Amino acid sequence: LVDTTEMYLRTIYELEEEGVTPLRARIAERLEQSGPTVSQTVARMERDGLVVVASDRSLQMTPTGRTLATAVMRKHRLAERLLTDIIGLDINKVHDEASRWEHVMSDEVERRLVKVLKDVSRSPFGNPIPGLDELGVPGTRVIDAATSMPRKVRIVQINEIFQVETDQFTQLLDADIRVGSEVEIVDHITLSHNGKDVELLDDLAHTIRIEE
Amino acid sequence: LVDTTEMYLRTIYELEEEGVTPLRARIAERLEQSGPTVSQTVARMERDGLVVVASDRSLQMTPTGRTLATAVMRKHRLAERLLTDIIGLDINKVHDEASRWEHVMSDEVERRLVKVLKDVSRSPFGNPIPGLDELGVPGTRVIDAATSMPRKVRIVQINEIFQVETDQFTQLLDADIRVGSEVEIVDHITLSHNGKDVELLDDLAHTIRIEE
């Protein structure tokens, strides 16, 4: 959990954020790791397809690397909000505490935070909290979201347009399940609504989007 | 932070707690680590003086090992309280989330929690939260607590009885500093009170106890 790649990606994100060119020496300095250690960490982050060292020797985050960096910063900043507004930790300690929490905070906890905190637009240090959008502030496909224990979620998309199988359209219509419909899900993928039970086919089990 | 020793000590604490004999196989099972891995982890926890394998091959925690185990469980359980009462995380996820947070939660955060939570006597799973006493629910000696930036703390003990140096007794008396006196501290160790400033001698800087 508490990992290096997450820490490096956040650092790149920050420098980028402060308008600084993400150069390896700048990163080594901030993270207080030797230049040889960063060179080798960057060397393997490059193999995971998270970063690429541009011609000018600056670190360009790949789309995947950037998405990960964004989740880390969102978690870090939501941690800061929780620590100051709710917990009341001394403002002088908040940042260093949030730097450890960012690696162990789950998506599920972030969603709850986003709901219990008064304001999640900025961290107490003035910077905006990124990626709130990924937190329903499209959606999880049921095959991934659906657990062995029912959980009422909301249908975001059906994607009938991508269905080669249309046999269950009326089944959903009779079931009264559409975009915005609070439904019960169990993982074949059975999704209940209005007392009518619908066992989704694989194609539908893969393209229907929901939000917790 | 997120470490093995902490995890093992907590496991021993739990088994002990549930009345189970802390045997290595029981621990390997619960932690889902092979028997050889636990043998070697226990083998080095024994060298750190945290655990001793009793004659019957059961693990007896040393006083130091037990104190550490207690802090880990207190943190873990205060995390559970925070996650259910404040955050509202699903009761089915609370334990596994708290198991990661226990390694990154600072003492300073625990004290704040103890203040912001309605009840810290038990975790939502029915077990008591241990070591609250270590959280002021005696004290930190100023030499360790005193930081470069003043912070009004409360004097818990003076320990005049252990002072070979008595030159500053009247200095404190004139300073009106005693057990219960809210004082300002800066780290020689200067502790202000009622506008009068007292630069403690080493012996006093080491034995005076305070609580944040």
- Tell me the nearest-neighbour CA distance from B82 into chain A, angstroms: 9
- CB of B93 closer than 8 Å to CB of B119: no
Nearest to A104 among B104, B109, B113 (CB): B104
> What residue type is B72 in one-letter code?
V
Residue of A123, A110, A133 whose CA lies nearest to A17:
A123
Instruction: Report residue B174 as tokens.
Output: 């004139």
- Tell me the nearest-neighbour CA distance from A163 into chain B, angstroms: 34
d(CA B82, CA B176): 39
The H-or-E segment that residue B153 falls in is strand B153-157
Q: Which residues, listed in sequence order, are joined to residue A58 by a DSSP beta bridge?
A: A23
DSSP string, A35-46: HHHHHHHHHHHH
Which DSSP symbol is given to A62? P
Nearest to B106 among A97, A103, A104 (CB): A97
Instruction: Report residue A86 as tokens.
Output: 């709710």
Radius of gyration over alpha carbons of chain A, in Å?
21
d(CA B209, CA B212): 10
Q: What is the resolution of this structure in A?
A: 2.4
DSSP string, A85-119: III---TTTHHHHHHHHTTT--HHHHHHHHHHSS-
Contacts of B111 in chain A (CB under 8 A): none
Contacts of B104 in chain A (CB under 8 A): 2, 100-101, 103-104
Task: Name the experimental technique.
Answer: X-ray
Query: Which among B75, B78, B82, B87 is the top mutation candidate for probing chain A, defined by the most A β-carbons within 10 Å of its own β-carbon?
Result: B87
- CB of A184 closer than 8 Å to CB of A192: yes
Q: Which residues, listed in sequence order, are joined to residue B128 by a DSSP beta bridge?
A: B122
CB contacts < 8 Å between A and B, how many? 56
Nearest to A93 among B89, B103, B108 (CB): B108
Q: What is the 3-state secondary structure (H, E, C) of B35-67?
A: HHHHHHHHHHHHHCCCEEECCCCEEEECHHHHH
- B115 with A149: Cβ contact below 8 A: no
Tell the CATH topology of B138-212. Answer: SH3 type barrels. (2.30.30)
- Tell me the nearest-neighbour CA distance from B206 into chain A, angstroms: 25
Query: Which among A81, A109, A118 is the top mutation candidate for probing chain B, defined by the most B β-carbons within 10 Å of its own β-carbon?
Result: A109
Q: What burial class does residue A124 get, using C-beta atoms within 10 Å of its C-beta: 0-12 exposed, 13-18 middle, 19+ buried? A: middle
Closest alpha carbon within chain B to A93: B108
What does chain B come to in residues? 212
Contacts of A1 in chain B (CB under 8 A): 2, 100
Rounded to 5 degrees, φ, ψ at A52 are -140, 135
d(CA B162, CA B147): 24
CATH 2.30.30.90 domain extents, chain B? 138-212
The H-or-E segment that residue B26 falls in is helix B24-31
d(CA A189, CA A202): 8
CATH class of B1-71: mainly alpha
Q: Which CATH architecture has domain A72-137?
A: Orthogonal Bundle (1.10)
Distances (CA, A) of B81 to A154, B88, B121, B197: 28, 10, 10, 41
d(CA A185, CA B94): 21
CATH 1.10.60.10 domain extents, chain B? 72-137
Look-up of token digits 């979201």: A145
Contacts of A153 in chain B (CB under 8 A): none
The H-or-E segment that residue A183 falls in is strand A182-186
CATH 1.10.10.10 domain extents, chain B? 1-71
- A90 with B103: Cβ contact below 8 A: no
- A112 with B93: Cβ contact below 8 A: no
Distances (CA, A) of B11 to A2, A48, A87, B200: 21, 35, 28, 43
CB contact set of B45 (below 8 Å; sequence gap of 6+): B5, B8, B9, B51, B65
d(CA A84, CA B75): 19
- Tell me the nearest-neighbour CA distance from A153 into chain B, angstroms: 14
Pairing of strands B182-186, A140-141: unpaired
Contacts of A149 in chain B (CB under 8 A): 92
- CB of B8 closer than 8 Å to CB of B39: no
Look-up of token digits 């060298």: B47
Distances (CA, A) of A25 to A22, A199, B42: 9, 55, 40
- Tell me the nearest-neighbour CA distance from A103 into chain B, angstroms: 9
Closest alpha carbon within chain A to B83: A109
